[PDB]
Amino acid sequence: YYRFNTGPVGKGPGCGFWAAGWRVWLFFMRGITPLLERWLGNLLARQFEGRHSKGV
């Protein structure tokens, strides 16, 4: 925004440069994918296999 709102261009909304935040949130997904695949796999495996009482 400091580079965007420099001269005659004011301080309205008017700024879609979503590439930076887009990269930031996709690099979040890059690492959250194993964690959520493991967590959702255990969720589905407990729902369809049952809970093991004193197994571990």
Distance, in Å, from the CA atom of 4 to the CA atom of 11, rounded to the nearest integer, reads 9
User: Residues 7, 8, 11, 53: which binds ligand IHP (CB under 6 A)?
Assistant: 11
SS3 10: coil
Residue 31, both tokens:
């690492």
34 binds RNA (CB under 7 A): yes
Picked from RNA, ligand IHP, none, the partner binding residue 5 (CB below 5 to 8 A depending on kind) is ligand IHP
User: Residues 7, 13, 16, 21: which binds ligand IHP (CB under 6 A)?
Assistant: 13
Name the residues that contact RNA, by CB under 7 A. 23-24, 27-28, 30-35
